[PDB]
Amino acid sequence: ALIGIEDFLKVDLRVAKVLSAERVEGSEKLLKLTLSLGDEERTVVAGIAKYYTPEELVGKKIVIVANLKPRKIFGIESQGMILAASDGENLSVIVPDRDVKEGAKLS
Amino acid sequence: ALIGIEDFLKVDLRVAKVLSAERVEGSEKLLKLTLSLGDEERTVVAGIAKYYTPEELVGKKIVIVANLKPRKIFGIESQGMILAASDGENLSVIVPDRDVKEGAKLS
């Protein structure tokens, strides 16, 4: 490990609301979440093995690593990595306790 | 714009329930949350600028930075740092939506 003071600052974490969720034909993990980072809009595909319905995701405010990756080499539309809390088996989504505005810069 | 796969795995984050919140005699920084990472109990001085009640804290599941916090400011032996979904206007701490047991990771 290392004193991640500067390291954390480098990890531009922003909260965004999922405007909607696209879906593909057949292929699972089709959760193409349209994250609204305030003024910016980016697509990120979420796996979440049948643990979270797209309906509930609509309007859900999640924290995503903005400056992570603009595109995933494997074609998967991922303009940022969504922070998923992988419990002993349950994939919980990271969401703030109360109403937080879009583009929320963590610090 | 970096390989957010390897670096991500390195920074193993863990979820735990706050047992209690220690307070010092008098300082503009309190809430030494005794976060029990499943079987391990660590000391995390989550100052949280008077944003949370010591009462509601007892049982609250928060995500903490594990093997990435070897040392902290003033040398305070804080084994771990709590990820707060800050937005300037406020310091909304991260807490999982669906209730799950401890020992939860991040992936």
CATH assignment at residue B104: 2.40.50.140
Do the beta carbons of residue B30 and residue B57 sit within 8 Å? no
Neighbours of A72 (CB within 10 A): 16
- DSSP-derived secondary structure letter, B71: -
Amino acid at B76: I
| Torsion B10-A86-A66-A5 (CA) sign | negative
Counting one residue from chain A and one from chain B, the pairs whose CB atoms sit within 8 A come to 106
Domain that holds residue B76: 1-107
CB-based burial label for B62 (10 Å; 0-12, 13-18, 19+)? buried
Please judge whether B106 and A87 are an interchain contact, meaning their C-beta atoms are less than 8 angstroms apart.
no
Least Cα distance to B82 among B10, B21, B26, B27 occurs for B21
> At how many Å resolution was this determined?
2.5
Please judge whether B87 and A63 are an interchain contact, meaning their C-beta atoms are less than 8 angstroms apart.
no
Q: Is A19 helix (H, G, I), strand (E, B) or coil?
A: strand
Judged by phi (left if over 0) then psi (alpha if -120 to 50, else beta), residue A75 lies in: left
Q: Which residue of A has its CA nearest to B104?
A: A87
Q: Which residues contact B73 (CB under 8 A, 6 or more apart)?
A: none
Write out chain B residues lying below 8 Å of A70, CB-based.
Answer: 1
CA distance B107 to B103: 13
CA distance A64 to B32: 27
Q: Which residues contact B6 (CB under 8 A, 6 or more apart)?
A: none
DSSP β-bridge partners for residue A34: A43
Q: Is B58 an 8 Å CB contact of chain A?
A: no
Do the beta carbons of residue B81 and residue B65 sit within 8 Å? yes
Q: How many domains does chain B have?
A: 1
Neighbours of B7 (CB within 10 A): 12
Report A:1-30 residues touching B (Cβ under 8 A): 1-4, 7-8, 13, 15
Do the beta carbons of residue A97 and residue B92 sit within 8 Å? yes
Q: Which residue of B68, B85, B107 is in closest CB contact with A15?
A: B85
Q: Which residue of A has its CA nearest to B84?
A: A106
How many helices (H) and strands (E) in chain A? Answer: 2, 8
Least Cα distance to A93 among A40, A21, A24 occurs for A21
CA B73 to chain A, closest CA, distance in angstroms equals: 9
